[PDB]
Design a protein around this ligand. Structure first.
Ligand SMILES: CCCCCCCCCCCCCCCCCC(=O)OC[C@H](COP(=O)([O-])OCC(O)COP(=O)([O-])OC[C@@H](COC(=O)CCCCCCCCCCCCCCCCC)OC(=O)CCCCCCCCCCCCCCCCC)OC(=O)CCCCCCCCCCCCCCCCC
Ligand SMILES: CCCCCCCCCCCCCCCCCC(=O)OC[C@H](COP(=O)([O-])OCC(O)COP(=O)([O-])OC[C@@H](COC(=O)CCCCCCCCCCCCCCCCC)OC(=O)CCCCCCCCCCCCCCCCC)OC(=O)CCCCCCCCCCCCCCCCC
Ligand SMILES: CCCCCCCCCCCCCCCCCC(=O)OC[C@H](COP(=O)([O-])OCC(O)COP(=O)([O-])OC[C@@H](COC(=O)CCCCCCCCCCCCCCCCC)OC(=O)CCCCCCCCCCCCCCCCC)OC(=O)CCCCCCCCCCCCCCCCC
Ligand SMILES: CCCCCCCCCCCCCCCCCC(=O)OC[C@H](COP(=O)([O-])OCC(O)COP(=O)([O-])OC[C@@H](COC(=O)CCCCCCCCCCCCCCCCC)OC(=O)CCCCCCCCCCCCCCCCC)OC(=O)CCCCCCCCCCCCCCCCC
Ligand code: HEA
Ligand code: HEA
Ligand SMILES: CC(C)=CCC/C(C)=C/CC/C(C)=C\CC/C(C)=C/CC/C(C)=C/CC/C(C)=C/CC/C(C)=C/CC/C(C)=C/CC/C(C)=C/CC1=C(C)C(=O)c2ccccc2C1=O
Ligand SMILES: CCCCCCCC/C=C\CCCCCCCC(=O)OC[C@H](COP(=O)(O)OCCN)OC(=O)CCCCCCCCCCCCCCC
Ligand SMILES: [Cu+2]
Ligand SMILES: [Cu+2]
Lengths: 145, 552, 220, 76, 139, 67, 186
């Protein structure tokens, strides 16, 4: 039904079986590997200590930014217990969104701290580093319950 | 809409994730990984022995080694390189990719699989642990000829451990061959006929048959030798035909062995060429027939290793070797026709396969020259034979093993090895090999026999030994890029989220997740040819494949 | 059992020896096996002596000191462990060795040290029967005594954690039965067997660990 | 307990499951020192000194690697 | 199972022809007559391939086509239940260690060590064989 | 002949060859894309990353900012 | 799915072929050093007792038929006839082993030893390995009987019975060949 972009096939199950050209990659994140690994480790060890998922979004928010962020949070696995940080570098906009279960655990005192750290580190031009700093601060703020 | 991923996949795995799984596992993927790692460790040990030998061979005179030590060195080098690296790396690759290629969830006997692995490991350790004896390790040749291996001559305890370790490893190999034959015969997808299975699978089948022919007779001969050494058993007594009896039995075992360590690597390059030429394999049934003919002929030439004894029927064996030289040429022509008129790209596996082609061609030419008894009458037991079998052995096992590692690392780990490090590795290996083993032809042509610990300055051949030692040190330093690459790329390194990271792949292993799940498959495609994954990923091509196939 | 082995196996044949005399000796040594670790310590300890004003401290003083240190540290372990861990409660239920990895690794390390000392006591017998040099056996014991116990510790720790993870897998899924299906669209499944209730989708509901062993074979 | 995670050690609340890292670091250093001292008063021969220095260097390298990686954040 | 048996029969034909040719050409034209070693080896190589090909023929002549033997077959044809495949087991490494003990005892001539290794081999093979057949403890 | 020559060649040729081959090969560019600069527009597809660690739609709050 | 040809059967048959190659090695050893011994090649202190070698051969040939009766009983799923026929086969195999050992004792008492001559060497190395294979078969019989005792009878148990059956048949045929080669041809 879809495009199946030149190498993909729909199998006897719903799984797609894609391919890659012999020299190219299959990820294409415009950040260094030792940046992505530090972000992954921060994101994992903050969640393990706060007992809540942490999520990061970098695409556009070409609408009401808060409304778009709250529509985005719906795609996190367990959205009721999750904290999301969305950033638009085109609109220079930052948003943080909460969940129903993660409430009263130390969050309202941590979201502006995280926004402040993220903005402060974006003022130099370090996107991944600002994300890491914000996630560290927020995860150190939140408490398990 | 959106999908939740991670910034980077997990690097290592939780604490306590491997050790107990390693002791209790029964899955062929992990067993093949263990095969590969231990075989490469043994390769490093054998290469260290070879470096010591080269260092002594330069600069006439005995600088730091003794005669006994040099003898132990070439004995153990040959033993390790031939029986602790190549024969088990064959079954490593088999356990890695044969069930995925026939479409099975498992091997036939998963506990016999692990038994074979552990038997290999402990037999190799038993045979190597002769160096800690005051007499040293075995110091007769790798061939262990007739009266030199009794208890009068060679009375130490290293040869005993050698014999028993070889027996244990041979039992492991026999069990592995039985397992592979049964797996290919019984377990097979519900549409895959025997003339739709890959050439690698065909070659593993044939190699297992040869294993079952060759190894039991070596076990019998070794038990006879142990009976002699421990009970005075008159079996290899030269008062009988005991001197030639040993040679006949040993070479009947030993030539099928050098073919056992060649056909799976022929199969490896036969899998690799079509993917990077974007074309079908040229002469599928012809390659199958050539494999079968080589296998049949390989058990009837054994005595071309006995030309200079004056006790063999020369024309029979000479004609048989001249005959066996032909299907290899047919196979070469099929490999050339596969690449002919394609769209060639040269990544690391393709580069290594082309290097294999060149090196093995030169080695096979020197061998077919070696098959003439009047020429062997001069060039036997010299460095010409050493250069020959190093060309053929290196070209097949080293180059095809590296090509297969670079090919199937994504399929077994989910990561990609680096390409610049791989190109550096390849060029270092190529230059070092051709620097170390080319001048040895001339070296042995002017009189210089093999297994010589020392020579004189008034003899010739002193600059050529220096050149060969330079080349050997290049070959030694060529392993650091590869080891660093594997060590870095296992944990870091580009992830693979698709099937078939090398586009245009075949053989049903590129139609599953890149790290395959336990039981290897969540679905199967319709099997109409020997390129089921190709027809699955490119359905607009099946018509154009059936149409223009028999043009020629 | 004791009568059978006291009748069928010869032990301490004193007549093959003679009476003790200060001038004769034999290659025989090695007291009964429960005293062998002291003999091995005396064999592999290096000769470190001290000489100061008209006095002397020989090398076997080290052996005596290590022996007394072991004899002191053995009865003090409960108090040392309760001080370290801070656990002063009453206990009537036992622990499984896999659930206490640090203590299991400590015990494995101590057993490895004891086994090295016990093998070092039969230096000459080992060198004679297994063709190894006497100097080689001495140095092998001397180096193993320091490098083997921590290796055993590391391996024991990881092994206990692996056993725990095996238990957790069996608690999350069912017992693996060994039977494979083919699922007409070409998938291979393994047909687990649950120990408790299942959901509406058929997959078993995960259970909690309770300090008891879990079945791993279907026939048990 | 002083503390490990149940994602690292599943049965962390059933028994002693954590030993500090400084203990192991200084223990490795002391074992290296003992191996080095064990060649004082060298009796004739030097083949065993090579084994001594080899094992001491290997232990020091292991300890240093672990310390470095824990310091730069690639462990824990 | 036609192609497997055909393969083994081709091998049998070649091995038998080579065996008889070598035997005759050494009975004549050779130094001391028949060679008596390569002849025996070739004869029993023929016997090996013959046994295997005969078993395959006899199981094939009393069988109906399997889905892997059959082109134009669908994956839905092989749906069902395959046999039993052993999950995790620790008995192979114990069998290997027992065999290694016996082999060291045979290398260094130590009859007590050979006896201990044989006893260990018996015990570990029994462990392997009885693994999925022991019942619950009867108390 | 000329012990110094022999040892110099055997010890030095491999390292020089290693150095020149490394300078040729390891100084090239890999397939990894270049790091994105905030001065340029965001051209990549949308990115969503999660933690995966806590294992088994009513919003509870939020916050905003403009750098 | 059910892939009707049995898998353990195939594995056993191919391993039996390998063991045939092992005995090929032994036979080559024996046939060499007979072409060297001139004239009366079995030396004078060597005289073969045909009054002991034919009875044990008959007992082994009868073992083959009792084992075939056991597998016939196995194919119709009752365990007790299987147990009876296999106990009989075990007893006959033990009788063969004891006869061989007694003949060895009598042959060493006043003559051939391994270090004595070349004939004694080839003889003992060729027949003692066959004896070890018989002992392996006996151990296999015991293990199979215990496994049939310890659980419910199934087609897997029947397959185990069948594969042990033709292992025993292989051993009997190898003995026939060795006996005909050594005692009659000479
Ligand atoms: C086509 C595909 C190609 C295939 C591969 C190609 C082959 C190329 C050749 C290789 C060249 C370089 C190799 C680089 C290695 C890559 C490292 C990596 O990142 O991969 C991790 C990779 C992933 O591991 P994981 O399970 O996902 O996570 C690991 C956990 O974090 C932790 O799990 P854990 O807690 O259970 O601990 C596991 C334990 C492993 O335990 C052991 O095996 C220890 C014993 C081995 C050494 C004994 C020597 C004495 O690890 C360690 O011990 C830590 C490292 C030890 C320090 C090294 C000493 C430096 C000096 O590991 C593998 O998959 C390797 C599989 C098998 C490798 C070992 C096979 C050995 C088989 C039997 C050994 C028994 C011999 C007995 C004799 C000696 C007596 C003891
Ligand atoms: C010389 C070396 C001898 C090699 C041993 C023979 C290897 C033959 C393997 C061919 C087929 C493989 C197979 O069926 O896998 C079963 C099993 C592998 O388990 P799996 O991979 O999970 O697959 C299980 C199947 O699905 C189905 O598994 P299953 O439960 O249905 O098992 C079928 C059947 C297995 O069917 C057979 O293969 C029966 C053939 C008996 C061979 C007797 C060997 C004679 C020793 C030569 C003396 C020199 O098992 C039995 O019912 C009883 C087997 C009794 C074996 C006793 C061997 C005696 C060793 C003690 C030596 C001391 C005496 C001399 C002093 O392997 C074994 O049971 C045999 C282990 C061999 C240990 C190596 C000895 C060192
Ligand atoms: C980014 C990478 C690229 C960088 C490139 C290189 C960078 C630096 C290079 C510098 C030098 C390079 C040389 C290193 C080689 C690297 C290769 C390597 O390490 O393996 C790769 C890699 C190592 O992983 P990793 O990144 O290091 O992660 C380590 C753990 O994740 C986390 O480790 P952990 O925090 O859990 O710590 C583990 C360890 C701590 O780590 C260490 O510090 C090292 C320890 C070594 C020496 C310690 C000996 C202590 C002895 C003292 C005795 C007791 C005191 O703890 C222990 O278990 C040590 C045992 C000590 C026992 C002491 C207990 C004391 C109890 C109280 C007793 C008191 C009285 C004493 C009396 C005794 C008498 C009864 O291997 C793997 O991940 C898996 C291996 C897969 C299979 C491989 C097997 C192949 C076999 C071939 C055949
Ligand atoms: C050089 C060696 C020096 C010799 C040392 C002294 C030898 C004396 C014998 C050793 C101890 C005496 C045993 C007395 C009990 C006898 C009563 C009995 O048979 O009840 C069956 C009894 C089951 O009783 P249960 O309480 O209802 O347990 C049922 C569970 O399902 C249990 O099921 P499971 O899942 O827990 O696993 C069963 C496990 C349970 O079997 C064992 O645990 C026995 C081994 C424990 C020894 C300590 C190991 C420490 C090593 C570290 O056995 C196995 O895994 C297979 C091993 C094969 C055992 C038989 C092979 C004998 C080879 C002879 C050559 O199992 C056995 O003990 C059979 C082993 C003894 C065989 C009978 C005597 C044969 C003599 C050889 C003839 C020549
Ligand atoms: C994998 C390893 C391997 C391989 C593939 C081979 C392949 C061959 N070998 Fe070799 N050989 C060894 C490993 C190998 N060998 C070893 C290890 C020893 C000695 C061991 C020891 O003593 O320690 C040895 C020794 C050895 C000897 C005895 C030398 C001596 O001891 O004096 C002989 C002589 O008959 C021989 C012949 C051949 C022949 C005819 C081939 C053929 O397979 C090659 C034919 C293939 C070709 C590539 C031909 C190319 C085809 C075409 C392109 C058409 C060309 C047309 C013509 C020129 C006819 N080998
Ligand atoms: C697959 C088989 C195989 C392989 C791969 C090799 C690899 C090499 N061989 Fe060997 N060789 C044989 C099989 C093989 N050989 C056989 C069968 C004989 C005849 C035996 C007989 O006479 O009995 C022989 C004999 C032989 C001789 C003649 C000895 C004698 O007869 O006098 C020489 C010398 O020129 C030699 C050289 C080399 C070199 C330079 C390599 C290089 O390719 C290898 C260099 C590799 C490395 C240097 C590894 C790197 C080492 C390290 C980095 C050290 C690290 C240390 C540890 C990790 C422990 N070989
Ligand atoms: C407090 C709390 C915090 C922890 C408490 C534990 C703490 C660490 C204890 C401190 C350590 C310290 C006190 C111990 C030092 C070591 C010892 C006690 C010094 C000397 C001990 C020794 C001389 C007496 C033991 C008896 C033996 C060894 C004396 C000599 C000796 C004799 C007498 C034998 O009869 C003998 C017979 C056969 C073989 C050998 C010997 C032998 O060596
Ligand atoms: C290798 C196996 C060889 C043969 C196997 C069949 C055994 C056939 C037994 C018949 C031999 C015979 O009866 O010959 C009597 C002679 C007269 O020697 P003597 O000079 O007169 O006196 C001097 C006496 N102290 O004694 C002997 O050689 C005794 C022979 C010892 C028995 C065989 C050892 C079996 C061990 C097998 C190894 C398995 C290890 C497994 C690891 C893979
Ligand atoms: Cu050859
Ligand atoms: Cu020769």
């Amino acid at each position: 039904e879809l495009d199946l972009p030149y190498g993909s096939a729909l199998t006897s199950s719903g799984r797609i079986s894609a391919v890659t050209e012999p020299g190219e990659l299959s990820v294409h994140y415009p950040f260094p590997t030792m940046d992505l690994v530090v972000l992954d480790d921060a994101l994992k060890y903050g969640s393990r200590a706060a007992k809540a998922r942490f999520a990061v979004y970098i695409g556009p928010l070409g609408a009401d930014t808060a409304a778009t962020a709250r529509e985005i949070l719906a795609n996190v696995p367990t959205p009721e217990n999750a904290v999301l940080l969305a950033v638009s570098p085109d609109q220079r906009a930052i948003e943080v969104v909460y969940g129903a279960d993660v409430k009263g655990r130390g969050i309202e005192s941590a979201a502006p701290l995280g926004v402040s750290a993220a903005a402060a580190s974006f003022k130099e031009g370090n996107l991944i580093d600002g994300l890491i700093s914000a996630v560290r601060v927020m995860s150190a703020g939140v408490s398990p319950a | 809409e959106l999908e939740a991923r991670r910034p980077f996949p997990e690097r290592m795995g939780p604490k306590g994730n491997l050790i107990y799984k390693l002791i209790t596992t029964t899955d062929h993927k992990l067993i093949g990984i263990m095969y590969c790692v231990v075989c490469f460790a043994f390769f490093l040990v054998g290469g260290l022995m070879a470096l010591f030998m080269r260092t002594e061979l330069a600069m006439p005179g005995l600088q730091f080694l003794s005669n006994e030590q040099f003898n132990q060195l070439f004995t153990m080098h040959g033993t390790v390189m031939l029986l602790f690296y190549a024969t088990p790396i064959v079954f490593g690759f088999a356990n890695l990719v044969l069930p995925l290629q026939i479409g099975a969830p498992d091997v036939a006997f998963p506990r016999l699989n692990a038994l074979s692995f552990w038997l290999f490991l402990f037999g190799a350790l038993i045979a190597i642990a002769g160096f800690i004896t005051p007499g040293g390790a075995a110091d007769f040749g790798w061939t262990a000829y007739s009266p030199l291996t009794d208890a009068i001559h060679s009375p130490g305890a290293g040869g005993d451990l050698w014999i028993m370790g070889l027996a244990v490893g041979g039992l492991g190999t026999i069990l592995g061959g039985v397992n592979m034959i049964t797996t290919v015969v019984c377990m097979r997808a519900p549409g895959m006929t025997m003339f739709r299975m890959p050439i690698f699978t065909w070659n593993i089948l044939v190699t297992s048959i040869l294993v079952l022919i060759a190894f039991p007779i070596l076990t019998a001969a070794l038990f006879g030798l142990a009976a002699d050494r421990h009970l005075g058993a008159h079996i290899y007594d030269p008062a009988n035909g005991g001197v030639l009896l040993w040679q006949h039995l040993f070479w009947f075992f030993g030539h099928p062995e050098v073919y056992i360590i060649a056909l799976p690597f022929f199969g490896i390059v036969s899998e690799i060429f079509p993917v990077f030429s974007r074309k079908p394999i040229f002469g599928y049934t012809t390659l199958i027939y050539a494999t079968l003919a080589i296998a049949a002929l390989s058990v009837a030439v054994w005595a071309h290793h006995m030309y200079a004894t004056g006790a063999v029927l020369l024309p029979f064996f000479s004609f048989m070797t001249f005959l066996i030289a032909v299907p290899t040429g047919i196979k070469f022509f099929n490999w050339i026709g596969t690449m002919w008129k394609g769209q060639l790209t040269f990544e690391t596996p393709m580069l290594f396969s082309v290097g294999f082609l060149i090196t093995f061609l030169l080695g096979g030419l020197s061998g077919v020259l070696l098959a003439s008894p009047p020429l062997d009458f001069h060039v036997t037991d010299s460095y010409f034979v050493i250069a020959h079998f190093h060309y053929v052995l290196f070209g097949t096992i080293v180059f095809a093993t590296y090509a297969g590692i670079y090919f199937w690392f994504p399929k077994m780990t989910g990561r990609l090895l680096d390409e610049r490090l791989g190109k550096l590795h390849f060029w270092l290996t190529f230059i070092g090999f051709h620097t170390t083993f080319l001048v040895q032809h001339w070296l042995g042509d002017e009189g210089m026999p093999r297994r010589y610990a020392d020579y004189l300055p008034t003899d010739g051949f002193t600059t050529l030994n220096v050149i060969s030692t330079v080349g050997a040190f290049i070959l030694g330093v060529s392993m650091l890029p590869f080891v660093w690459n594997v060590f870095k790329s296992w944990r870091y390194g580009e992830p693979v989220t698709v099937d078939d990271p090398w586009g245009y792949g075949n053989s049903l292993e590129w139609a599953t997740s890149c790290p395959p799940p336990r039981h290897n498959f969540t679905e199967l495609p319709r099997i109409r040819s020997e390129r089921p994954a190709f027809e699955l990923h490119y359905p607009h091509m099946v018509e154009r494949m059936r149409a223009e196939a028999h043009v020629g | 059992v004791l009568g059978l082995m006291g009748g069928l196996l010869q032990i301490n044949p004193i007549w093959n020896l003679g009476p003790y005399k200060p001038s004769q000796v034999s290659a025989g040594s090695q007291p009964d096996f429960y005293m062998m670790w002291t003999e091995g310590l005396a064999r592999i300890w290096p000769p470190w002596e001290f000489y100061f004003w008209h006095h002397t401290i020989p090398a076997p003083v080290w052996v005596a000191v290590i022996m007394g240190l072991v004899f002191v540290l053995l009865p003090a372990y409960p108090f040392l462990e309760k001080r370290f861990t801070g656990d002063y409660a009453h206990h009537n239920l036992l622990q499984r060795p896999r659930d206490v990895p640090v203590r299991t690794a400590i015990g494995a390390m101590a057993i490895a040290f004891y086994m090295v000392l016990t093998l070092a006591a039969m230096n000459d017998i080992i060198a004679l029967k297994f063709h190894i040099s006497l100097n080689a056996t001495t140095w092998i014991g001397r180096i193993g005594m320091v490098i083997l116990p921590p290796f055993v510790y590391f391996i024991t720790y990881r092994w206990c954690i692996g056993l725990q993870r095996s238990d957790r897998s069996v608690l999350e899924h069912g017992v693996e039965t060994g039977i494979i299906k083919r699922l007409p669209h070409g998938a291979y499944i393994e047909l687990h067997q649950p120990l408790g209730p299942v959901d509406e989708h058929g997959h078993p509901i995960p259970l909690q660990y309770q300090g008891a062993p879990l079945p791993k074979r279907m026939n048990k | 307990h002083t503390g490990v995670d149940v994602e690292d050690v599943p049965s962390a609340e059933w028994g002693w499951s954590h030993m500090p890292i400084g203990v192991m670091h200084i223990g490795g250093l002391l074992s290296a020192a003992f191996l080095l001292v064990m060649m004082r008063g060298n009796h004739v021969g030097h083949v065993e000194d090579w084994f001594l220095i080899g094992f001491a260097a290997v232990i020091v390298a292991l300890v240093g690697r672990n310390w470095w990686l824990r310091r730069r954040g690639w462990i824990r | 199972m036609h192609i497997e048996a055909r393969l083994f029969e081709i091998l049998t034909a070649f091995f038998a022809l080579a065996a008889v040719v070598y035997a005759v050409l050494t009975a004549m034209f050779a130094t001391g007559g028949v060679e008596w070693a390569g002849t025996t080896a070739l004869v029993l190589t023929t016997g090996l391939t013959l046994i295997t090909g005969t078993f395959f023929r006899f199981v094939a002549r009393r069988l109906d086509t399997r889905p892997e033997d059959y082109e134009d077959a669908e994956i839905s044809d092989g749906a069902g239940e395959l046999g039993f495949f052993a999950p995790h087991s620790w008995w192979p490494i114990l069998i290997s260690l027992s065999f290694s003990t016996a082999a060291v005892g045979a290398a260094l001539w130590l009859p007590w060590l050979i006896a201990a290794g044989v006893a260990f081999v018996i015990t570990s093979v029994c462990g392997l064989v009885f693994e999925y057949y022991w019942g619950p403890e009867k108390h | 002949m000329s012990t110094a020559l022999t040892h110099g060649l055997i010890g030095g040729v491999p390292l020089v060859l290693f150095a020149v081959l490394a300078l040729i090969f390891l100084t090239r560019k890999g397939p990894h894309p270049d790091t994105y600069k905030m001065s340029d527009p965001w051209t990549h597809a949308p990115i969503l990353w999660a933690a995966e660690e806590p294992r088994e739609v009513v919003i509870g709050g939020g916050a905003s900012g403009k750098w | 799915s059910l892939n009707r040809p049995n898998m353990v059967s195939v594995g056993t048959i191919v391993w039996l072929s390998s063991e045939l190659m092992f005995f090929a090695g032994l036979f080559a050893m024996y046939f060499t050093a007979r072409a060297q011994a001139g004239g009366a090649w079995p030396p004078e202190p060597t005289e073969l007792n045909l009054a002991l070698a034919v009875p044990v051969t008959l007992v082994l040939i009868a073992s083959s038929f009792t084992c075939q009766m056991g597998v016939f009983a196995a194919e119709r799923g009752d365990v007790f006839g299987l147990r009876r026929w296999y106990v009989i086969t075990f007893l006959m195999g033990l009788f063969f082993v004891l006869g061989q050992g007694y003949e060895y004792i009598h042959l060493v008492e006043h003559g051939t030893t391994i270090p004595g001559s070349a004939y004694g060497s080839v003889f003992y190395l060729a027949t003692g390995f066959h004896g070890l294979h018989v002992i392996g078969g006996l151990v296999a019989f015991v293990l199979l009987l215990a496994r049939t005792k310890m659980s419910k009878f199934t087609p897997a148990q029947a397959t185990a019975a069948i594969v042990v059956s033709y292992y025993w048949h292989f051993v009997d045929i190898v003995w026939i060949a060795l006996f005909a080669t050594i005692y009659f041809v000479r």
